[PDB]
Every structure is written in structure tokens, then in C-alpha cells.
Amino acid sequence: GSSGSSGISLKYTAARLHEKGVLLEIEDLQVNQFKNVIFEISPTEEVGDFEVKAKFMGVQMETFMLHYQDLLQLQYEGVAVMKLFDRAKVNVNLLIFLLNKKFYGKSGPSSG
Template sequence: MDNLASKGKVSKKPGDIKGKKSKQVSQKYTAARLHEKGVLLEIEDLQSSQFKNVIFEISPADEVGDFEVKAKFMGVQIETLILHYQDLLQLQYEGVAVMKLFDRATVNVNLLIFLLNKKFYEK
């Protein structure tokens, strides 16, 4: 996990000092966008036409391999949770295809891992 985190944080832009760490920014997605990507399958008690009003903000937490996920509905923060990357990998290893976030949102485990890898670990 430390190796993945250090790969993702090292800035490789031209002119940067070699090995200089850059702060990772949070990634914001509407539920509609995550649904398009196949990451989000459904949200209980919410029609897919309302997905544009839900925003998920994913940011690296203090611990390596942990992500803070915030859910907002129409700009109002509803819930926050800490997502453990290691737990996702364990679910993937066990062949679990879907999981619940916030006890309401059903997500595709493999595509969520892919998204986290692409946005936070692949630089």
C-alpha cells in the first residue's frame, strides 16, 4: 500500500523537483456519471433521473489506502464514510461483485477499484 501511495503522490510534471510530493485532490462525481461508468448500480429510494442531484466526493484519508467518501444531495452533505482499499481488494478476491455504500448505494466492486487506481494511484 505504501508503494502504491508513493507512486500516486510523486509529481512527474516537467520542471518539478524529482521526488517532490504533490497534494492529491479530491475527485467529485455525480451519481449519474458513476452510473454511466458502471460504478454505481443503484441508490435505494432514488430514481435514476435524480442521480444528477447526488455528488460523491472521494479524497485520500490520512492513512495510506483509506479514502474518505462524502455523499451530498442537492449540495447538502448527507453522509461521510471511510473506505478501506484493502477491504475492497478482499471483496474482489472473494469474488464479491457488488457492495453497499452508506447502506443505500450499490456499487460494482471491480469498477470502484479500477476508478480508485486510475485517479489516485496511476500517475
């Protein structure tokens, strides 16, 4: 319960997210190029906020954040496609689905 290596940022390739359906396309590279693209999603201590980083150059100055409410706001409006970094595109309908099982999974008391 205590002695357990927890944390670490999830590492997935662009092709992986594309194959599943999450990642739509990228306004810069091609489908076959996805193989040379990896996304590093760092988790958070709280529930709702997430760290979305794209391994390419190595920006250790800041990281793109992604709230949970924002993802839902798009579902209510209609925006199915999400413009990331004004280039990469991900499906909001599937993006939330994956995280719902990936990160979404605490191990504490609920009481409600």
C-alpha cells in the first residue's frame, strides 16, 4: 500500500493514438511520420488537470495543461476536433474516453 513506485508520465506514440482513433491528424507531418512522434502525458496530484507534452526538442521551461471542464465544454458546443499547438488534432470524443480509463482511476475513499 505504501512501498509502490507510482507516478511517471505516460509515453505513447502518435501512431498509437491515431490507430485507436483518438489522434485525428497533424498539420505538419504525415501518417507514416507518426512513427517519429511521441507524446508525453504527465499526470497530476489532483483530479481534473493533466500535463500534455510532445517530445520533440525538449522544453523544460513549461508544459501544456489540459483541464477536464474544457474537454466537456467542446462536447456541449459541438467542437469534436481539438486544435493542439495549432497543428496536431485530437478527437475530444475519444480523448476523454481514453483518459477516463487511463488517468481516471484513483485508489482512495469515495464516500459519495
